[PDB]
A paper describes a structure:
Thyroid hormones T3 (tri-iodothyronine) and T4 (tetra-iodothyronine or thyroxine) are essential regulators of metabolism, development, and growth in all vertebrates and some invertebrates. T3 and T4 are formed from the precursor thyroglobulin (TG), a ~660-kDa homodimer specific to the follicular lumen of the thyroid gland. T3 is formed when the mono-iodinated phenolic ring of a donor tyrosine is transferred to a di-iodinated acceptor tyrosine; T4 is formed when the donor tyrosine phenolic ring is also di-iodinated. In addition to being the site of hormone formation, TG functions as a reservoir for thyroid hormone storage until it is trafficked back into the thyrocyte and degraded in the lysosome, liberating T3 and T4 for secretion into the bloodstream.
Here we report a ~3.3-Å cryo-EM structure of native bovine TG with nascent thyroid hormone present at the predicted hormonogenic site B. A cryo-EM reconstruction was obtained with a ~3.3 Å overall resolution and a ~2.8 Å local resolution over a substantial, presumably more rigid part of the complex, sufficient for building an atomic model. The structure is essentially identical to that of recombinant human TG6, including conservation of multiple glycosylation sites. Close agreement between the density map and the model confirms that the acceptor tyrosine is 3,5-di-iodinated (top), as required for thyroid hormone formation. The map for the transferred donor phenolic group appears ambiguous regarding iodination state (top), as might be expected if the map includes a mixture of donor mono- and di-iodination states (corresponding to nascent T3 and T4, respectively), heterogeneity in the orientation of the donor aromatic ring, or both. Tandem mass spectrometry analysis (LC-MS/MS) confirmed that there was a mixture of nascent T3 and T4 at position 2573 in the TG sample. At the predicted donor site (bottom), the map fits a dehyrdroalanine residue but does not appear to accommodate the original tyrosine aromatic side chain, whereas the map makes a good fit to other side chains of the loop containing the donor site (pale blue), including the aromatic side chain of the immediately adjacent residue F2439. The nascent thyroid hormone at hormonogenic site B is accompanied by a substantial alteration of neighboring structural elements as compared with pre-hormonogenic human TG6. The helix-loop-helix motif formed by residues 2515–2548 (dark gray-blue) is substantially reorganized, rotating F2539 (green) by ~80° and displacing it by ~9 Å from its initial position. This rearrangement moves the acceptor tyrosine (red) away from its close apposition to F2576 (gold), flips the residual donor site far away, and packs the double-ringed reaction product into an interior pocket bounded by α-helices.
Author numbering:
A (entry chain B): 1326 to 1330, 1364 to 1372, 1436 to 1453, 1458 to 1467
B (entry chain A): 31 to 105, 116 to 131, 137 to 257, 267 to 351, 362 to 380, 408 to 428, 434 to 505, 549 to 607, ...
C (entry chain B): 2168 to 2528
D (entry chain A): 2529 to 2549, 2553 to 2727
E (entry chain B): 603 to 607, 613 to 637, 644 to 723
F (entry chain B): 898 to 909, 918 to 973, 983 to 1010, 1025 to 1060, 1065 to 1084
G (entry chain B): 2649 to 2727
C-alpha cells in the first residue's frame, strides 16, 4: 500500500470479474446485469 | 515544544551536519534528509533511522509512522488509514489522537460513534486541571480556531482565567462596555495557532480593550470582534486577511533552517501542485502535503468521455449561481472599486460560518453601519494609515519597532508590499460598506452547503463562473484541451467561431494587439500607446514604430539591437528568411532545422534537400516546380486522393457512417478504439471545407460512374510557366491568365489568343508608361525599361534602357549573371 | 400533465408521519358556511378547477361586502363597516363600480354599491396560509354573473394561498376631492384601506393569516395601490407584508394631484353636470343628487385626452396621506416591504383610456 | 512642455469652450454624451468629450453639408466614413488621407503597412482618382459608364431617410447607410432648435 | 427583379419546382427571412403564421389604442380552435375560416 | 386499418403500442437502422464521400446518375447518434449500448427505469417523463397511482 | 398555458416567501420550474429584471436610454 496499491486482489467497492459485498451473496447471474441480492433473515 | 524542535534547535546552534526536518505538529518528517540532500533516510516518530533505508536521493515513499509502529509489534495492531496515518479510532475499541497514544477516557467495548478532536480534548483536559485556565477557541469541526485569543491581566502579567470568570460572570462579556466595567485591567491578546494549537512564533498582537446569551467565549461577540481586528492588523502586516497556513509555517521554517526541501506555495495558501526538492527529484503533492504515490521526475479527456456517453444513450457551470450573482450586479461591483484571494479570505475572517452571516445581515439593515458593527468601529480604515499604532496595538510579540525600522514613521516570511496592503485594506473597507454586499450574503447563505462548504468556498465557485448540445471536445496527448474545437461546421479556438474552414489560432502578435487595443480604451483621448501591427497570417510586421522611432523586430516582436532609426526614412532590416535563420540557429544551439536564404534575402528555392515557395513555407538536387506546375501537382494529388478514397471504399475498410461523423467533427480516437491508415483518410474530411466537399463529390461521382461501367488540371508550357491561354479541356471556356495563373479579363469560335508574359507587360508599359525596373535597387527613372518582345512572344534576349542594356532569359523578365546567354544556354546553368 | 407534490425534509428518515389537515369550522361541505365573528354565517360556494389533468376543489365566496353601499348621501364620504347580520349569500359576483366610459344604457351589473371583495380559498391547506388582496375593478365586458371577472381560483390553487379580489370605487366617485377641509379626500383609497382591515380581522375565519397579506394591484390602479407604501398608518397594525404593483408606482407624475388642480378639476365637473360651483358645501350637495349615469357621462367627457384630460387621483389631505409620495420616500425606511414591481410594453396612457375614446366616438 | 496641465478648473472649462463658448445646449449635450465634468479623470471625461466634439464639429457638419449639397442639387455627392483604426499613430494623417495618397507605398514606410493595407490603399487611390478625373468615383472617364471592377460601387449620397448611402473605408470597402442618425439628429434638430 | 436576392447546390422536386427546404453545411432554410435553423430541419410557415405575420405588420400602421384581428397559431402552426376579435369569438376550421354558427360572445364556454 | 397517436399523426385489428412501447419501437428501429448501415458498409455499395456529402446536404439524385441516405441528409442530432452507433459497431464487431426503456406487460412505463449497464436507475412518471448515480438499492419509485394518491 | 403556470409560481412564491424564486421563507432550495428571478439592484452595471416571455429570460437595463431622459435630463429641466 505504501506504493499506492502471491495472491493479491484489488477489489473496488462502487480481468475485472464482478462480485459483491460479503453478506449479500451473488445470484445465478454468472458474469455480465443485476445481481447479489441482500441475504434475507433466512 | 515537541520531541523534534528540541533536537532541531540544538543542531542549528551546535551546527552538527544534520537538522532533523520536522513538519508542523512538531513531529519528525517521515523522510529526513542530510545536510545537503545527499542521502535522505526515512525515520519513525522517535527519530531512529530505519536500517533498511539510507539511499541517496529521496526514498520512494517510505512507510508511515503507523505501519512503522505496526510492523514493529509483529517482531493489538494499529489500523492505519489509507493515507498512512493513524485511524481516528483504534480497536476494548478505544480511540486515539493523531500521534498514537490513546485519548484518556475512551476504552469501550464497541466503536465510539464519534470521539473528540484535537481541541475538545484540550478543553476537557483543562477542566481536569492541567494547563492555564483559558480554553482554546475550537472550530465547530473540533479543530483549533486559526486565530486564538487569550486575555491578559495587565497587572503582574498572568493570563486572565476564563473557565472561571466566564462561568460565574457570563453577563460581563455581553459587550465590551460591560467587560471593561467588570475587568478594567484586562488587555486582550490575540495570536495565530498551528494545527496543534501551539502558539506560533512572533505572531502575537496584544490588542487593547479600552476604546472599542452565548457560551464558551468562542461564540461571544467579544471574540469575533477581537479576531476581526487581529485579522485586519494582519492584512497590513502580512498582506492577507488570515493567519499563515500549514504550508507557510513549514516554508518559513524551511527558509529559516535552510534545509534541502523548502516547500513551494502560492498566496492562496494551499500547497503548490508540485514541490521540487532542490538537489533531487520533484513530485506532485496534495493539499495535505502528502506526496502522490508516484510522480517522481488538463480536464478534456473526462469531458470528452462524458460527451460520448451522451451519444451512447441512443434516441429518447454551477447550478443557478450564474443568474443570481453574476447576471445581476450583486457580484460585478464586488471586485471593482483587488485580488480574489484578498476577497476570498475577507469573508472567512468575517462571517466564519453561514449561521453567522445570517445573524449579521438581519441585525444591521444599514450597509454603512456594517463596518462599525463587525470591527467595533471604523477599525480597518484606521489601520491603513497605521493610526492603530498607539490606539489599539501594544507591546505583544511582533516587534512593530523592527517592522517600522524598514518603513517610515515580514511576519512569517511574507514580503510586505506596504502600499498594496494599504490599497487592499482600503478595498475591503469600501467593499464592506457597499449596498450590494448585503445582497451577496443573502445569496451566499442560500447556496447548498454540499457544493460550497463555507462562505469562502461559496465565493470561489461564483468567481469560477464569471463568464461561463451534442458536442465532444477533442484532446491532445495528456489531456491538454485541444486548441480548435469543431462541431457541425462550427470551429472555434475562445472568442472566434468561424464556419467551414479550420480557423487559425491567434498568434502572439494578435494576442498582444488585442490586449493593447483593449488597453487603449482606457487611455485619454489624444494620447496613444504601442499597438503592434500583425500581418494577415499573424506574424509581427517587420518594422514596429511607436512615435518617430521605428525598430525592426524579430519573429516574436522583440526589437533587434541596432536598426532603431527615426520614422520616415528607409530602413532595410533582416528579411523574414534571415530572421527565421537566426531564430532557428538560436533554438537549435540552445537545445544542445537550418533555413538557408539567398544572398538577396529571399528564401532560397531549395531549403534544407527539399524546395519551398518564396514565403518559405514547406512545399512537397531536387529541382522545384514553376508557377503553374505546382498548381498542377495540387490537382494531380487531389485526383490521387479521390482515387484513394474510391479504392478504400472498394476495400470496404471504412464504416459508412464515420465519414458523416467527420463532417460534424466527431472523429472518434484510436486511443479508445485500439483495434486498428484509418486516421489518414479521416484527416481529409474532418476539417469540413470546400476542399473536403469537392473531394467527396469527386469520389462519389467516380464510385457511381466507374463501378458499373473532369478535374481541371491547368495547361502548362515546357518550362513550368503558365500557358497564356487556359482551356477547361472539355466544352472549354478558354479564359487566359497572366504570368502567375491569375485570370485576366464562353463556347466562342476561334479560341482566344492572349498575350504572353511580356506582350501584356509591354502593352501596359506603352499605354500608361508603367515601366519595369532594371536594377531593383532604387532605380533612377532611366533604369526603367519597357520590355522588348520578339515576335513569337518570349522576352527578347537583351533588354535595353536609357541607362544601359542587360541580358534576360526569355522565360521571364529576370536578369541573369553574364555575348548574351540564350535560352538553352541559360538553362544550362 | 399533472401536479406532483412532495414534502421537503432536512434529511432522510425511515418513518414519515404527516397529520391531515382539519377544515376550519364551516368548510368541508360544498356550501362552506363560514362563520365570521360579530356578523354571522357567510355562506359561499365551492368550485373545482382544473390546471393540468388534475383538479383542486376551491371554495369561492363571491360578493363579500366590506363597507356600506356608497349610494345616495354616502357617496362622496369615506366608507364605514356594513354592520350586516345573519347569513350572507356570497355566491354570486356583485355589481362592479362605475368607471369612465361605460356604454349607454348602463349595462347590467354596474352600480355605485360596488364595495365587495371576492375570496377564493382552496379547500384544505396549511393552517396559516398567505393572502393576496388584489384590488381590481372589473371591466365592462368581463364577468357573466356566474363567474367573476378575474377568477383568482387558479392563482389560489397553484400557490396554496387565499386570493381576495377586492373592488373599490375609482373616478369621481372614488376621488372627487376639492383640496379643502370639507370635501378633500380619496374615498376610493380610504375604502381600499378598509378592504385590508377586513382582510386583517375576518381572514382568520377562512384559512388565511393576517400577518402575510400581499397588496397587489394592476394597470393604473397600482398608482392608487402604491400610495399605501407611502401613507403612514398607526404603524402598529401593518395591513400588508409585500406589494405586487403591476404597471405603476407611487413616483409616477400623476400619482397624486395637486390641490389647486383638484379644486378646479371638480369645478369643471360641477359646472358640466349643472351644479352651482359657488361653494363646496353647495356644490357637492348637488352632485349627491345627480344619478350616477349622468354623473359618469360627465367624467368620461372631461377625462378624454384631447381636451381637458382631467385625471382623478389621490389628493394629499393631511389626515390619511399627508406628504407627496416623492417626499415621503426620501425619509428612512421603517418597515421592510418587499416589492415585485413591473410593467408591460402593451401598456400606455392611451391604452388605459381605451374605454373613454370609444365613448367619445 | 510649458508645465501647466489638466486641473479641476480645466474639466468644467474645456467642456464649456468646446460645446458652448449657451447654458441649455450644454445641459443637453452633457446629458446626451454623459459628460460628467465633475468627475476628475481625463481618461474618461476626455474620451467622452472627444466624441461630443467630433459629433458637433467634425462629423455632423460633413453630413449636413452632404445633405444640403444633394438636396438643393449642386452636383454629385459621395460621402465616406473611415472607421477608427488603432494602428498608425506617429503619422499626423488619418486613415483616409494615408490611403487616398498612397502612404503605404512610400519607400520610407516599407514594412510598416500590411499587404491588406496596401491593397486597400490602392483601391481607395483608384476611387479618389476616378473622382478627380470624372467626378464619380465609380467611373474613371466622364464619357464611359463601365462599372468599376476594383471595388464595390460607391453609391451616390441621396439624403432620403430611407437610404442615404456612404462608403466605409475598411478592408472590404462596404456601403452603409445612416452614418450617425441618432447623434447628428440630436445636433442638427434638437440643439439647433434650442439655439433659438 | 433584382429586388432582394458559395458551394451550395439547391434541391429540386419533380419538374423543376424549387424544393421547399434547402439544407447546406448544418444550416437549413425554406429565400424567405426567419428560416435559418442551425441543425435539424425548419418548418415551412403554415397559412396561419403567414396571416399572423402580415396582420402583425399591418398592426404597426394602426394608431395606438386601436386593434384589429391578429389570428393566433399553435406551436406547430395550426389555427387555434377559437378566434376572437372583440367580445365575439368564432370557432374556426383548419384554414382559419369561421364555422357557421358557434359565434358566441367572449367569456363563455364554447 | 392503422393507428395514430392522440394528435392524429401517423404511427407506424392493428392493436398497437402504449405509452412506452412506442418509445421503445423507436429505439428498436434506431438500432435496426444502425445495423442496416453496418451491413451496407460490409456489402460496400456506398462510398465514404457519399456519406460526407449527404452530411453537408448535397446528396446526389439517381436522375442524374441512372446507374443505380434519407437518414443522414437532415443534419439532425438523431443522424449524429445513428452514425456514431454505426461506426462504433463496425470497428468493434469487425475485428472481433442503446438505452431501450424497460416496459411492463401492458405497454405502460415501468416506474423505475435503469440504464441496464452501469445503470443510474432513475424513475419515470406514467408517460416516461423523468421525475426527480451508481447508488446501492436501485431506487423503488411509486407506480402511476401511488404518485397520484400521494399528491392528492 | 405553460408559461402562465410558471408565472403563477413566481407570483405565488413571492406572495408566500417574498422572493419569487423560493416558495418557503425558511428554505432556500433553488427553483426548477423556470430560471431564477434575479433581485433588482440599481447599479448601472447590471439591474436585472425578468422578461415575461416564453423562455422567461433575465435581461438588464430595461430602458437605459429612455428613462435616463426622463429621470436625469427632464427632471433637471423641471427646475
Ligand atoms: C485615529 O485614531 C484615534 C484614536 O483611535 C481617533 O481619535 C478618536 O476619534 C474618534 C472618531 O474619529 C472619536 O470617537 C474618539 O473620541 C477619538 N478618541 C481619541 C482618544 O482621540 C482618530 O479619530 C483617528 N483618526 C485620526 C485622523 O487621528
Ligand atoms: C489582576 O492583578 C491584580 C493584582 O493585584 C489582581 O488583584 C486582580 O484580581 C487581577 N485582575 C482581576 C480582574 O482579578
Ligand atoms: C526588534 O528587532 C530588533 C532587530 O535586531 C531586535 O534587536 C530587538 O531586540 C527587537 N525587539 C524586541 C522587543 O523584540
Ligand atoms: C471494385 O472492385 C471490383 C472487384 O472487387 C472491380 O471489379 C471493380 O472494377 C472495382 N471498381 C473500382 C472503381 O475500383
Ligand atoms: C353598527 O351598530 C352599532 C351598534 O351595535 C352602532 O354603534 C354603529 O354605529 C353601527 N354602524 C352603523 C354603520 O350603523
Ligand atoms: C397559526 O395558526 C393558528 C390557528 O391554526 C393561529 O391561531 C396562530 O396564531 C397562527 N400562528 C401564529 C404565529 O399566529
Ligand atoms: C461482413 O463482416 C463479417 C465480419 O468481419 C465478415 O466475415 C464478412 O466477410 C463481411 N461480409 C462479406 C461479404 O465479406
Amino acid at each position: 500500500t505504501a506504493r499506492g496499491f502471491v495472491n493479491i486482489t484489488w477489489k473496488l467497492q462502487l480481468r475485472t470479474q464482478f462480485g459483491c459485498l460479503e453478506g449479500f451473496g451473488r445470484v445465478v447471474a454468472a458474469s455480465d446485469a443485476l445481481g447479489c441480492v441482500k441475504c434475507p433473515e433466512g | 515544544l515537541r520531541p523534534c524542535e528540541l533536537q532541531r534547535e540544538r543542531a542549528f546552534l551546535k551546527r552538527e551536519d544534520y537538522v532533523p526536518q520536522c513538519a508542523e505538529d512538531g513531529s519528525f518528517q517521515t523522510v529526513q534528509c542530510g545536510k545537503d540532500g545527499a542521502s535522505c533516510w526515512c525515520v519513525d516518530a522517535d527519530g531512529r533511522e530505519v536500517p533498511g533505508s539510507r539511499q541517496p536521493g529521496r526514498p520512494a515513499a517510505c512507510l508511515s509512522f503507523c505501519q512503522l509502529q505496526k510492523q514493529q509489534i509483529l517482531l493489538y495492531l494499529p489500523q492505519c488509514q489509507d493515507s498512512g496515518d493513524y485511524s481516528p479510532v483504534q480497536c476494548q475499541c478505544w480511540c486515539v489522537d493523531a500521534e498514537g497514544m490513546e485519548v484518556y477516557g475512551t476504552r469501550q467495548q464497541g466503536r465510539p460513534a464519534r470521539c473528540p478532536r484535537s481541541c475538545e480534548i484540550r478543553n476537557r483536559r483543562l477542566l481536569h486541571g492541567v494547563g492555564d485556565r483559558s480554553p482554546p477557541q475550537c472550530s465547530p469541526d473540533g479543530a483549533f480556531r486559526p486565530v486564538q485569543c487569550k486575555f491578559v491581566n495587565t497587572t503582574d502579567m498572568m493570563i486572565f482565567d476564563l473557565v472561571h470568570s466566564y462561568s460565574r460572570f457570563p453577563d460581563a462579556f455581553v459587550t465590551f462596555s460591560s467587560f471593561r466595567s467588570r475587568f478594567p485591567e484586562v488587555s486582550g491578546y490575540c495570536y495565530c495557532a498551528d494545527s496543534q494549537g501551539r502558539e506560533l512564533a512572533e505572531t502575537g498582537l496584544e490588542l487593547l480593550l479600552d476604546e472599542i446569551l452565548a457560551s464558551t467565549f468562542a461564540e461571544t461577540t467579544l471574540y469575533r470582534i477581537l479576531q476581526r481586528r487581529f485579522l485586519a492588523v494582519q492584512l497590513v502586516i502580512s498582506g492577507r486577511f488570515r493567519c499563515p497556513t500549514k504550508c507557510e509555517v513549514e516554508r518559513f521554517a524551511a527558509t529559516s533552517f535552510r534545509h534541502p526541501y523548502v516547500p513551494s506555495c502560492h498566496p492562496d495558501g494551499e500547497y503548490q501542485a508540485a514541490q521540487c526538492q532542490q538537489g533531487g527529484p520533484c513530485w506532485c503533492v496534495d493539499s495535505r502535503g502528502q506526496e502522490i504515490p508516484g510522480t517522481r521526475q488538463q480536464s478534456c479527456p473526462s469531458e470528452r468521455r462524458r460527451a460520448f456517453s451522451r451519444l451512447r444513450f441512443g434516441p429518447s457551470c454551477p447550478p443557478s449561481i450564474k443568474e443570481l450573482f453574476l447576471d445581476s450586479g450583486i457580484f460585478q461591483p464586488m471586485l471593482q472599486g483587488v485580488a480574489p484571494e484578498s476577497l476570498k479570505e475577507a469573508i472567512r475572517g468575517l462571517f466564519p460560518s453561514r449561521e453567522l452571516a445570517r445573524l449579521a445581515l438581519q441585525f444591521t439593515t444599514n450597509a454603512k453601519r456594517l463596518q462599525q458593527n463587525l470591527f467595533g468601529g471604523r477599525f480597518l480604515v484606521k489601520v491603513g494609515q497605521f493610526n492603530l499604532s498607539g490606539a489599539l496595538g501594544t507591546r505583544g510579540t511582533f516587534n512593530f519597532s523592527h517592522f517600522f525600522q524598514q518603513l517610515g514613521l515580514g511576519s512569517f516570511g511574507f514580503e510586505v508590499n506596504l502600499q498594496e496592503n494599504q490599497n487592499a485594506l482600503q478595498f475591503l473597507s469600501s467593499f464592506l460598506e457597499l449596498p450590494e454586499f448585503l445582497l451577496f450574503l443573502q445569496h451566499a447563505i442560500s447556496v447548498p452547503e454540499d457544493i460550497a462548504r463555507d462562505l469562502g468556498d461559496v465565493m470561489e465557485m461564483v468567481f469560477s463562473s464569471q463568464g461561463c448540445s451534442l458536442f465532444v471536445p477533442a484532446c491532445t496527448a495528456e489531456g491538454s484541451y485541444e486548441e480548435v474545437q469543431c462541431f457541425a461546421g462550427d470551429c472555434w479556438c475562445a472568442g472566434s467561431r468561424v464556419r467551414g474552414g479550420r480557423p487559425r489560432c491567434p498568434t502572439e502578435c494578435e494576442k498582444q494587439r488585442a490586449r493593447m487595443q483593449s488597453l487603449l480604451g482606457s487611455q485619454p483621448a489624444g494620447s496613444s500607446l504601442f499597438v503592434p501591427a500583425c500581418t494577415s497570417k499573424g506574424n509581427f510586421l517587420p518594422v514596429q514604430c511607436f512615435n518617430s522611432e521605428c525598430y525592426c523586430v524579430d519573429t516574436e516582436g522583440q526589437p533587434i539591437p541596432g536598426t532603431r532609426s527615426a520614422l520616415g526614412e528607409p530602413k532595410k532590416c533582416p528579411s523574414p528568411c534571415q530572421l527565421q535563420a537566426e531564430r532557428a540557429f538560436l533554438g537549435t544551439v540552445r537545445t544542445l532545422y537550418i533555413p538557408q536564404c539567398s544572398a538577396s534575402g529571399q528564401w532560397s528555392p531549395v531549403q534544407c534537400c527539399w524546395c519551398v515557395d518564396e514565403a518559405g513555407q514547406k512545399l512537397e538536387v531536387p529541382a522545384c516546380p514553376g508557377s503553374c506546375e505546382e498548381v498542377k501537382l495540387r490537382v494531380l494529388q487531389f485526383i490521387r486522393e479521390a482515387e484513394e478514397i474510391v479504392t478504400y471504399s472498394n476495400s470496404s475498410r471504412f464504416p459508412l457512417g464515420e465519414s458523416f461523423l467527420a463532417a460534424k467533427g466527431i472523429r472518434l480516437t484510436d486511443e479508445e478504439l485500439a483495434f486498428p491508415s484509418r486516421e489518414t483518410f479521416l484527416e481529409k474530411f474532418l476539417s469540413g471545407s470546400d476542399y473536403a466537399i469537392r473531394l467527396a463529390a469527386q469520389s462519389t461521382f467516380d464510385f457511381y460512374q466507374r463501378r458499373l461501367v473532369s478535374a481541371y488540371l491547368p495547361q502548362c508550357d515546357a518550362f513550368g510557366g503558365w500557358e497564356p491561354v487556359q482551356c477547361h479541356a472539355a466544352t472549354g471556356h478558354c479564359w487566359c491568365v497572366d504570368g502567375k495563373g491569375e485570370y485576366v479579363p464562353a463556347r466562342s469560335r476561334q479560341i482566344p489568343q492572349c498575350p504572353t508574359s511580356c506582350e501584356r507587360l509591354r502593352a501596359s508599359g506603352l499605354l500608361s508608361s508603367w515601366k519595369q525596373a532594371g536594377v531593383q535597387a532604387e532605380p533612377s527613372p532611366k533604369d526603367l525599361f519597357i520590355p522588348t518582345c520578339l515576335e513569337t512572344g518570349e522576352f527578347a534576349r537583351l533588354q535595353a534602357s536609357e541607362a544601359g542594356t542587360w541580358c534576360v532569359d526569355p522565360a521571364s523578365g529576370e536578369g541573369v549573371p553574364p555575348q548574351c546567354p540564350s535560352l538553352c544556354e541559360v538553362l544550362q546553368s | 400533465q399533472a401536479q406532483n407534490c412532495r414534502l421537503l425534509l432536512h434529511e432522510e428518515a425511515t418513518y414519515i408521519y404527516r397529520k391531515p389537515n382539519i377544515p376550519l369550522p364551516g368548510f368541508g361541505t360544498s356550501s362552506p358556511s363560514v362563520p365570521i365573528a360579530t356578523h354571522g354565517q357567510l355562506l359561499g360556494r365551492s368550485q373545482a378547477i382544473q390546471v393540468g389533468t388534475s383538479w383542486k376543489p376551491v371554495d369561492q365566496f363571491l360578493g363579500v361586502p366590506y363597507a356600506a353601499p356608497p349610494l345616495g348621501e354616502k357617496r362622496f364620504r369615506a366608507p364605514e363597516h356594513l354592520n350586516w347580520t345573519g347569513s350572507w349569500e356570497a355566491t354570486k359576483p356583485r355589481a362592479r363600480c362605475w368607471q369612465p366610459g361605460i356604454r349607454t344604457p348602463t349595462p347590467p351589473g354596474v352600480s355605485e354599491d360596488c364595495l365587495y371583495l371576492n375570496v377564493f380559498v382552496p379547500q384544505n391547506m396549511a393552517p396559516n396560509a398567505s393572502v393576496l388582496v388584489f384590488f381590481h375593478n372589473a371591466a365592462e365586458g368581463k364577468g357573466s354573473g356566474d363567474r367573476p371577472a378575474v377568477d383568482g381560483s387558479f392563482l389560489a390553487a397553484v400557490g396554496n394561498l387565499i386570493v381576495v379580489t377586492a373592488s373599490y370605487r375609482t373616478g369621481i366617485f372614488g376621488f372627487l376631492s376639492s383640496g379643502s377641509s370639507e370635501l378633500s379626500g380619496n374615498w376610493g383609497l380610504l375604502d381600499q384601506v378598509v378592504a385590508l382591515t377586513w382582510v386583517q380581522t375576518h381572514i382568520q375565519a377562512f384559512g388565511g393569516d393576517p400577518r402575510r397579506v400581499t397588496l397587489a394591484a394592476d394597470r393604473g390602479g397600482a398608482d392608487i395601490a402604491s400610495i399605501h407604501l407611502v401613507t403612514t398608518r398607526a404603524a402598529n397594525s401593518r395591513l400588508f407584508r409585500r406589494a405586487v404593483l403591476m404597471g405603476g408606482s407611487a413616483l409616477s407624475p400623476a400619482a397624486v394631484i395637486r390641490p389647486e388642480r383638484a379644486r378646479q378639476q371638480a369645478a369643471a365637473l360641477a359646472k358640466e353636470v349643472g351644479c352651482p360651483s359657488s361653494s363646496v358645501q353647495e356644490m357637492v350637495s348637488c352632485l349627491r343628487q345627480e344619478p350616477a349615469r349622468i354623473l359618469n357621462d360627465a367624467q368620461t367627457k372631461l377625462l378624454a385626452v384631447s381636451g381637458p384630460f382631467h385625471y382623478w387621483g389621490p389628493v394629499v389631505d393631511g389626515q390619511y396621506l399627508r406628504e407627496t409620495p416623492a417626499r415621503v420616500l426620501q425619509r428612512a425606511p421603517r418597515v421592510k416591504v418587499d416589492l415585485l414591481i413591473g410593467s408591460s410594453q402593451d401598456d400606455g396612457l392611451i391604452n388605459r383610456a381605451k374605454a373613454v375614446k370609444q365613448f367619445e366616438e | 512642455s510649458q508645465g501647466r496641465t489638466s486641473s479641476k478648473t480645466a474639466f468644467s472649462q474645456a467642456l464649456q469652450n468646446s460645446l458652448g463658448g449657451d447654458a441649455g445646449v450644454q445641459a443637453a449635450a452633457t446629458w446626451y454624451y454623459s459628460l460628467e465634468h465633475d468627475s476628475d479623470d481625463x481618461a474618461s471625461f476626455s474620451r467622452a468629450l472627444e466624441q461630443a466634439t467630433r459629433d458637433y464639429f467634425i462629423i455632423c457638419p460633413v453630413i449636413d453639408m452632404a445633405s444640403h449639397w444633394a438636396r438643393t442639387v449642386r452636383g454629385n455627392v459621395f460621402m465616406y466614413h473611415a472607421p477608427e483604426s488603432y494602428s498608425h499613430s506617429s503619422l499626423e494623417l488619418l486613415t483616409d488621407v494615408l490611403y487616398a495618397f498612397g502612404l503605404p507605398f512610400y519607400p520610407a514606410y516599407e514594412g510598416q503597412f500590411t499587404l491588406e493595407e496596401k491593397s486597400l490603399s490602392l483601391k481607395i487611390m483608384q476611387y479618389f482618382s476616378n473622382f478627380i478625373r470624372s467626378g464619380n468615383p465609380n467611373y474613371p472617364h466622364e464619357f464611359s459608364r463601365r462599372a468599376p471592377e476594383f471595388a464595390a460601387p460607391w453609391p451616390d449620397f441621396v439624403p432620403r431617410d430611407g437610404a442615404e448611402s456612404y462608403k466605409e473605408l475598411s478592408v472590404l470597402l462596404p456601403n452603409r447607410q445612416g452614418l450617425k442618425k441618432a447623434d447628428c439628429s440630436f445636433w442638427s434638430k434638437y440643439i439647433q432648435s434650442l439655439k433659438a | 427583379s433584382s429586388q432582394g436576392c458559395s458551394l451550395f447546390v439547391p434541391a429540386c422536386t419533380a419538374e423543376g419546382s424549387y424544393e421547399e427546404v434547402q439544407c447546406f453545411a448544418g444550416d437549413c432554410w425554406c429565400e424567405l427571412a426567419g428560416s435559418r435553423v442551425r441543425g435539424g430541419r425548419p418548418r415551412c410557415p403554415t397559412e396561419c403564421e403567414k396571416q399572423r405575420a402580415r396582420m402583425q405588420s399591418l398592426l404597426g400602421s394602426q394608431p395606438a389604442g386601436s386593434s384589429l384581428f391578429v389570428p393566433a397559431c399553435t406551436s406547430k402552426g395550426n389555427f387555434l380552435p377559437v378566434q376572437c376579435f372583440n367580445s365575439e369569438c368564432y370557432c374556426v376550421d383548419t384554414e382559419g375560416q369561421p364555422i357557421p354558427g358557434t359565434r358566441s360572445a367572449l367569456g363563455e364556454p364554447k
